[PDB]
Design a protein around this ligand. Structure first.
Ligand SMILES: Nc1ncnc2c1ncn2[C@@H]1O[C@H](COP(=O)(O)OP(=O)(O)O)[C@@H](O)[C@H]1O
Lengths: 914, 306
C-alpha cells in the first residue's frame, strides 16, 4: 500500500530511507488496527511492525536485510472498542507510543441537526415542502434510534446499526427525489418509507422482526409526519422502480409483474436456460438488487438459502441493467494466484474499457482467508494495491496514460491517473456476494468482515415462506391434467390451507406438498431452517412427469381393454360371452383412475425426499404423507408399494442380476437412482459394492473417475464428449468446475448442446450419464452440491436389523404363513402380466379366426383356460383379504422383539466403538 | 436484374457467404417491383420473384449448412435421399455446387430430415475436431535441446510432451465409446498406433538419458576409476558414441513423432539402457567389493568412496 506514495532512497549515512514521494507529509490510516488475528503463541506481527515503525522509526527489508529508516511518515490507526466481537486486544508495548482518542456517537440529538442539514440540502429539488425538512430528519433519527435498541446483536450477529445507515438513507432519498417525478407529500412519505425499508429492514431475519419494523415505521410516521392520506407501508405493498418508466416512481404491482415476466422469458431464452417461475418475492428482490446495482458503489450480500434463486436473480438483474456478469471459475486446485489474475482481469475490464462488470462471489468461491482479504481490500478501497505493484504498476500507469487521453481529458500526474482509475473502478465494479448458510464458518467470516459488512447492502433473502411456495406450486401443477379424479371440496381448518380457498384438486395438491415439506423439515431439520426448498421444486417436477407418464399408461390400458371389448362384441363363440363378463375391468378403471394423483404424489415425494432416509424414517414420513392425503380429499391406493408401482419386473430382474441385494430398501434406493434422472444421483455407501453394480448395468460404457487424480479434469472432458457413463469414486470432495454439469445449465445451439467446464466449452453427446459416489457417510458435501444432487443412501443401518429378524422369525415361527406371504404378491404380479398376455393372445387369435371353423378349437380351449387364472386371481384376492389383517396383527409382536434387538445391537456397536 | 440474379445463383456453395446474401436478397426484393410490366407479364419476373422468395423463406437452413461440420459425405447423402440425384464427384468433393441445387433440395419441406442429418454432421465433427487437434499438436511438437560439456545433446522438459502423449492416447481410447466412431476408425487406429510407438520410445529414452547422465559423472571423466574398471568404461565409450549418433539423427528431424520412423531406434534404446544398467550393476558390485575389504567405508557412501 505504501509503494504508491513512498520512494526508496539511499545515502551513505542514510542507508535506504522510505520517505514521501511528494513533498507533503504522509499519514498512514490503518483502519481496524486491533482486528488482525494473532499467532498461536500470542503475538500479531502487523501490530509489532507498526510499533517498529513508530518506535525505531524504521524496519528491515526481508530480501536484502537493510535498515530502512522511514522519513516523515505518520501513523494514525482506528479501532473499535476491544470488547466488540472479533477485536483482538492490542499489546501495551504498541499503544504505549500512540495517543488514544475516544470518539463516541454524536449524542443522538446532534444527529437531528446533522441530518436536517442534509434534508435542507436535498429539498432544494422539491421546494414546495421546505417546511418539512425538520420533521423528516427527526423521524429518520428517531427511526435509527429505535432500530438500534430493538434489534441488538443478541438476536443476530449482523444487526449493527450506526449513523452510516442514516447517511445511506439520506442518499437514497435524494437519489430517488433527483431522478423521480414531481413529488407530493404522500409520495415523499412513501419514498422515505421505501428507503427506510431498504436500509434498516433488509437485513432483518424472520417475519416477526419485519412486522415489528413495520409497526415501528407506522408509529414514526404517525408521530412526526401526521399525514392523513397514506396506503400500506408493508414491504410488498410499496414498490419503487425505474424499470418501467424513465422516472423513479411507485409502480403498480400488475404492470411490474407483467414486465418482469416478459423480460424473464427473454432472459431465459437468449441467456442460459433455467425454467423458472415468477412470484411476488422474486419481483421484490429484483427491485432490491436493481436499486443496489444502480448506485455508484453498489455492492450487495445476498444471505438466503440454497436453491432460492439468488445467483440467477442477480444474473437477471445484471442483464436488465446491461452489466457484464463475471463469475470466478475456480476449482479445488485453484490457488491465490488464479484469484488474483481473475480480479486483475475484472479490474482491467472495469477501468481500461468501461465494462461495468458485476462480480458474483459465492461463499464457496473463496477457499482460504487470502481470498477474503483480497475482497476486503477491493471493497474497502476501490483498488487492490497488491495486484498492481512494482513493474506491473509501471505498465498500468502507462495503460492509464494512453486511455485517459482517449476520453478527451488531460491528466499527466501519476496521482491524477490513479485517482481516475480508482473512481472508474468504484463507479463500474459491483460485487454481489451470495452465501447459502450464514452459520458456516466461512460465511460467518464473510459477514463479520468489516469492509464487506460496511460496504455491502445485506439483503436477507431467507427461505421461502408458504405464500411463495404456493405461488410456485400453482404455476407448476397447472400443466398436468386433473379432470378425472372427481375432486370434492373438503372441510379443513383455515390454518391448514395455504393457497386461495380450496375449490379444485390442484389446491389440494399444493397444500399437501407444502404441508409435507414443512413436516419433513420439522422432523429432520432442527431449530432454524437454513435450507430453502430444493426438495419441493424437485418433487413438483417429478410429480408433473409422473402424472403424465401414469396417465399415458392408463390411457393405453383403457384403449386396449376397449378394443378387446369391441372385438368380443364383434365376435359373433359360446364361451366369449363369459369373456364379456371377465372384461368387467372397464369398471376397475374408474376406481384406479381416481387414485392416480394420490399414487403419483406419494411416488414423487418418495423419490425426492426419502432418498437419504433410514428404513424407519421412510415408513414414518410415508405414514405422515398418507395422513396428509387423507386430511384432504385426495384418494390413493390403500395397499401401495413403491417397488410395485414404479419399477417393473424386467428392470428388477436386471438389477438383481447386475449384483444388487435382495433388500426392499436397496430396491427402493436403486429405483430412486435410476428412475429419477432429471438430477445427478449421489450414491453414498461405505462398501463400494454399488460401483461395480452400476458398471454391470452399463457394461463397457462405464468410466471410473475421482476428484483426487490430476488428469480428472481432462478425462471427464473426454467422457462428456463421447458419451460414456461416469462414476466419480469420491463425492465428499468436489471441485466446482463440474458445477455447470451438476445443474443442467447448458449452452444450446443449432443442434449442438455445449457445457462450460473450467474455461473450455465441451459438447455433450447425449448418451452421457453422471453418478457421483461417496464412501464415508461421515464426510460432508458442499451446500451447492448437496441441494442440487439426488442423495441416495446405500448404507446398511441398524434399522435394517429391525425388519430382517422379522424375516427370520416368521421363517421359523409360521412357516406356512411366510410361504404364503411371498407367493401372494409374486403370483399377483405374474397374474397381472400373464392375464394381459393371454388377453392379447385371445385378441390376435380372434384376428386370425375371422371366418374359419376348424381353428375355433384352440380358441375354445384357451377360453376354458383363461377361466383358471381368473379363478386363481379371485381366490388370491379373497385369501389376501384375510391374510393382510393377520399379517399386520402378527407384525407388532416381532416389532416388540426388534425394539429390544436394535437397542442390543446399538449397545454392542458402542462397545465396539470404545 | 435477371443477369445478376442468374449469376448469383451459379456461385459455388464453397464460396457463398450468407452475410452478403442477405443484402443481395434485399436488393433483389427492392428491384423486383421497379421492373416494367413487360417483364411482369412474362415468366421472367414471376420466376425471379418466386426464386427470391424461396431464398428468403429459409435463412436458418443456409447458415446451418454453411457450418464447418458439413462434409462431402453429408452433401452426398442429402442429394441422394432428398434431391434423388447423384452429384458429380468433382462438383461434390470441393463443395462447388451452385445455389440452384440448394433450391432443388427444397429446404422448406425437407427441413426435418435436413436437421436430422445435420445433427449427425455436428457429432461427426465433434470426433473430427479432436482428431485434427491431436494431429496438429503432434505435427509441430519438438524436444528442447541443451548441450553439456561433452558433444552429446540432452533433452529437457520431458513432461510437457510425455503428458501430452499420454493424454492424447487416453483421448484416442475414449473415442471408441462414441457411436459415430466407425467412420473415423481407420484414421484413429493409425494415429493411436503411432502414438503408442512414440510413447514406448519416450519411455526408453528418458531412462537412457537419465542413466547416461548418472554414469558420466562416475565413468568417462575420472581416469583413475576407469583404470580400476577398464571393461566398464570401454563399453561406456561405445555406448556414448552410438547414443550420440542416434540422438543427432533423431534431432535432425525437427519433429518428435518422426523418430518412430528411424530404422532401429527403439531396439537401440533398449540395448543402450540394458548395457547402462549392467554397467551400473558392475559399479555396485565393485563398490561393495571395496567396502567388504575395509568395512569403515560403509560410513561414507558412494560419491565419497569414489
Ligand atoms: N421461482 C422459481 N421457480 C422455479 N424454480 C426456482 C425458482 N427459484 C429458484 N428455483 C430453483 O432454484 C435454483 C436456483 O438457482 P441459482 O440461483 O443458480 O442457485 P442459488 O439459488 O443456490 O444461488 C434453480 O436451479 C431453480 O431450479
Amino acid at each position: 500500500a505504501l509503494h504508491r506514495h513512498t520512494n526508496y532512497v539511499t545515502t551513505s549515512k542514510g542507508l535506504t530511507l522510505l520517505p514521501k514521494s511528494d513533498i507533503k507529509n504522509l499519514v498512514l490510516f490503518c483502519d481496524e488496527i486491533n482486528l488482525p488475528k494473532l499467532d498461536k503463541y500470542g503475538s500479531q506481527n502487523v501490530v509489532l511492525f507498526l510499533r517498529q515503525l513508530m518506535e525505531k522509526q524504521g524496519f528491515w527489508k526481508t530480501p536484502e536485510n537493510k535498515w530502512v529508516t522511514i522519513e516523515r511518515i505518520h501513523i494514525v490507526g482506528a479501532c473499535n472498542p476491544p470488547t466488540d466481537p472479533g477485536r483482538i486486544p492490542m499489546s501495551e508495548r504498541f499503544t504505549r507510543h500512540a495517543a488514544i482518542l475516544y470518539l463516541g456517537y454524536p449524542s443522538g440529538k446532534s444527529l437531528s441537526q446533522i441530518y436536517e442539514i442534509y434534508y435542507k440540502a436535498i429539498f432544494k429539488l422539491v421546494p414546495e415542502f421546505r417546511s418539512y425538512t425538520e420533521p423528516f430528519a427527526r423521524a429518520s433519527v428517531h427511526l435509527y434510534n429505535e432500530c438500534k435498541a430493538r434489534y441488538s446483536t443478541g438476536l443476530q450477529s449482523h444487526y449493527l446499526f450506526s449513523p452510516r445507515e442514516l447517511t445511506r438513507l439520506v442518499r437514497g432519498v435524494y437519489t430517488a427525489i433527483n431522478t423521480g417525478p414531481r413529488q407530493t407529500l404522500r409520495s415523499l412519505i412513501r419514498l422515505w418509507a421505501y428507503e427506510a425499508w431498504r436500509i434498516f429492514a433488509d437485513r432483518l431475519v424472520g417475519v416477526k422482526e419485519k412486522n415489528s419494523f413495520e409497526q415501528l415505521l407506522y408509529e414514526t410516521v404517525d408521530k412526526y409526519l401526521p399525514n392523513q392520506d397514506l396506503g400500506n407501508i408493508s414491504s410488498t405493498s410499496l414498490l419503487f422502480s425505474g424499470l418501467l418508466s424513465l422516472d423513479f416512481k411507485e409502480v403498480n404491482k400488475t404492470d411490474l409483474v407483467n414486465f418482469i415476466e416478459e423480460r424473464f422469458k427473454t432472459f431465459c431464452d437468449e441467456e442460459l436456460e433455467v425454467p423458472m417461475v415468477i412470484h411476488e418475492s422474486m419481483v421484490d428482490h429484483i427491485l432490491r438488487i436493481d436499486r443496489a446495482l444502480k448506485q455508484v458503489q453498489g455492492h450487495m450480500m445476498l444471505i438466503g438459502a440454497s436453491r432460492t434463486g439468488k445467483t440467477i436473480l442477480t444474473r437477471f438483474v445484471a442483464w436488465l441493467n446491461g452489466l457484464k456478469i463475471v463469475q470466478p471459475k475456480i476449482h479445488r486446485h485453484s490457488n491465490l494466484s488464479d484469484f488474483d489474475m481473475i480480479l486483475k482481469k475484472a479490474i482491467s475490464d472495469c477501468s481500461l474499457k468501461e465494462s461495468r462488470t458485476c462480480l458474483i462471489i459465492d461463499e464457496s468461491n473463496i477457499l482460504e482467508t487470502a481470498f477474503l482479504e483480497r475482497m476486503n481490500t477491493l471493497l474497502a478501497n476501490a483498488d487492490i494495491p497488491d495486484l498492481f505493484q512494482g513493474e506491473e504498476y509501471d505498465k498500468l500507469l502507462n495503460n492509464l496514460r494512453n486511455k485517459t487521453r482517449s476520453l478527451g481529458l488531460l491528466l499527466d500526474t501519476e496521482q491524477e491517473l490513479y485517482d481516475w482509475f480508482v473512481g472508474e473502478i468504484a463507479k463500474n465494479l459491483h460485487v454481489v456476494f451470495t452465501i447459502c448458510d450464514p452459520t458456516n464458518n466461512k460465511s460467518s467470516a464473510m459477514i463479520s468482515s468489516p469492509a464487506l459488512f460496511n460496504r455491502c447492502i445485506i439483503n436477507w433473502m431467507g427461505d421461502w415462506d408458504t405464500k411463495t411456495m404456493s405461488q410456485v406450486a400453482n404455476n407448476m401443477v397447472d400443466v398436468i391434467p386433473m379432470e378425472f379424479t372427481d375432486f370434492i371440496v373438503p372441510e379443513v381448518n383455515k390454518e391448514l390451507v395455504f393457497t386461495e380457498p380450496i375449490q379444485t384438486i390442484r389446491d389440494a395438491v399444493v397444500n399437501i406438498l407444502i404441508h409435507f415439506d414443512r413436516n419433513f423439515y420439522q422432523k429432520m431439520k432442527v431449530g432454524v431452517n437454513p435450507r430453502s426448498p430444493g426438495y419441493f421444486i424437485d418433487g413438483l417436477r417429478a410429480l408433473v412427469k409422473l402424472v403424465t407418464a401414469k396417465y399415458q399408461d392408463l390411457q393405453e390400458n383403457q384403449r386396449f381393454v376397449n378394443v378387446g371389448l369391441e372385438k368380443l362384441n364383434e365376435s359373433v363363440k359360446s364361451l366369449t360371452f363369459e369373456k364379456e363378463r371377465w372384461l368387467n375391468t372397464t369398471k376397475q378403471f374408474s376406481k384406479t383412475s381416481q387414485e392416480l394423483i394420490g399414487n403419483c404424489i406419494i411416488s414423487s415425494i418418495y423419490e425426492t425426499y426419502f432418498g437419504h432416509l433410514n428404513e424407519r424414517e421412510r415408513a414414518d414420513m410415508l405414514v405422515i404423507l398418507k395422513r396428509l392425503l387423507g386430511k384432504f380429499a385426495v384418494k390413493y391406493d390403500v395397499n401401495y408399494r413403491f417397488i410395485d408401482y414404479l419399477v417393473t419386473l424386467d428392470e428388477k430382474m436386471k438389477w438383481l442380476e447386475c449384483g444388487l441385494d435382495k433388500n426392499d430398501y436397496f430396491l427402493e434406493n436403486m429405483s430412486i437412482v435410476m428412475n429419477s434422472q432429471d438430477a445427478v444421483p449421489f450414491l453414498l455407501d461405505p462398501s463400494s459394492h454399488m460401483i461395480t453394480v452400476i458398471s454391470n448395468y452399463y457394461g463397457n460404457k462405464t468410466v471410473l473417475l475421482s476428484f483426487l487424480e490430476e488428469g480428472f479434469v481432462k478425462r471427464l472432458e473426454n467422457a462428456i464428449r463421447f458419451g460414456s457413463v461416469v462414476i466419480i469414486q469420491d463425492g465428499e470432495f468436489f471441485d466446482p468446475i463440474i458445477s455447470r454439469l451438476i445443474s443442467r445449465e447448458f449452452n444450446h445451439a443449432g443442434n449442438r448442446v455445449t457445457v462450460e467446464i473450467g474455461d473450455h466449452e465441451v459438447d455433450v453427446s447425449g448418451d452421457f450419464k453422471l453418478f457421483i459416489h461417496s464412501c464415508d457417510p461421515s464426510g460432508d458435501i458442499p451446500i451447492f452440491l448437496r441441494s442440487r444432487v439426488r442423495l441416495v443412501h446405500f448404507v446398511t443401518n441398524k434399522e435394517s436389523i429391525e425388519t430382517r429378524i422379522f424375516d427370520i422369525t416368521l421363517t421359523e415361527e409360521n412357516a406356512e404363513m411366510q410361504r404364503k406371504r411371498e407367493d401372494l404378491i409374486k403370483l399377483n404380479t405374474e397374474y397381472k402380466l400373464k392375464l394381459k398376455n393371454l388377453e392379447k393372445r385371445l385378441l390376435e387369435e380372434l384376428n386370425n379366426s375371422q371366418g374359419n371353423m376348424l381353428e375355433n378349437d384352440e380358441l375354445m380351449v384357451t377360453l376354458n383356460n383363461l377361466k383358471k387364472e381368473a379363478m386363481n386371481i379371485e381366490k388370491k384376492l379373497s385369501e389376501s383379504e384375510e391374510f393382510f389383517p393377520q399379517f399386520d396383527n402378527l407384525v407388532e409382536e416381532y416389532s416388540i422383539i426388534g425394539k429390544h434387538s436394535v437397542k442390543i445391537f446399538s449397545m454392542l456397536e458402542k462397545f465396539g466403538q470404545f | 436484374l435477371w443477369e445478376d440474379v442468374q449469376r448469383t445463383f451459379e456461385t459455388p456453395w464453397c464460396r457463398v457467404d450468407v452475410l452478403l446474401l442477405q443484402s443481395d436478397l434485399a436488393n433483389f426484393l427492392r428491384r423486383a417491383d421497379e421492373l416494367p410490366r413487360a417483364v411482369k407479364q412474362f415468366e421472367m419476373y414471376k420466376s425471379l420473384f418466386s426464386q427470391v422468395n424461396m431464398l428468403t423463406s429459409v435463412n436458418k437452413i443456409l447458415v446451418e449448412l454453411k457450418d464447418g461440420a458439413l462434409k462431402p459425405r453429408h452433401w452426398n447423402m442429402i442429394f441422394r435421399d432428398i434431391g434423388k440425384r447423384q452429384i458429380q464427384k468433382n462438383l461434390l468433393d470441393k463443395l462447388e455446387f451452385s445455389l440452384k441445387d440448394v433450391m432443388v433440395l427444397n429446404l422448406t419441406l425437407n427441413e426435418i430430415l435436413l436437421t436430422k442429418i445435420i445433427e449427425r454432421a455436428q457429432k461427426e465433427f465433434v470426433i473430427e475436431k479432436s482428431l485434427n487437434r491431436i494431429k496438429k499438436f503432434w505435427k509441430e511438437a519438438q524436444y528442447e535441446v541443451i548441450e553439456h560439456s561433452s558433444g552429446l545433446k540432452l533433452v529437457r522438459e520431458w513432461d510437457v510432451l510425455e503428458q501430452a502423449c499420454k493424454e492424447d492416447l487416453e483421448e484416442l481410447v475414449s473415442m471408441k465409446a462414441s457411436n459415430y466412431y466407425k467412420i473415423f476408425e481407420q484414421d484413429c487406429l493409425d494415429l493411436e498406433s503411432k502414438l503408442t510407438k512414440l510413447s514406448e520410445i519416450q519411455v526408453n529414452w528418458v531412462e537412457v538419458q537419465f542413466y547416461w547422465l548418472d554414469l558420466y559423472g562416475i565413468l568417462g571423466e575420472n581416469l583413475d576409476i576407469q583404470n580400476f574398471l577398464p571393461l566398464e568404461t570401454s563399453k561406456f565409450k561405445s555406448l556414448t558414441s552410438e547414443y550420440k549418433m542416434i540422438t543427432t539423427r533423431a534431432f535432425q528431424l525437427d519433429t518428435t513423432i518422426e523418430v518412430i520412423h528411424i530404422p532401429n531406434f527403439d531396439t537401440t534404446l533398449k540395448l543402450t539402457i540394458d548395457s547402462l544398467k549392467m554397467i551400473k550393476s558392475s559399479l555396485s558390485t565393485f563398490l561393495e567389493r571395496q567396502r567388504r575389504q575395509f568395512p569403515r567405508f560403509y560410513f561414507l557412501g558412494n560419491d565419497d568412496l569414489l
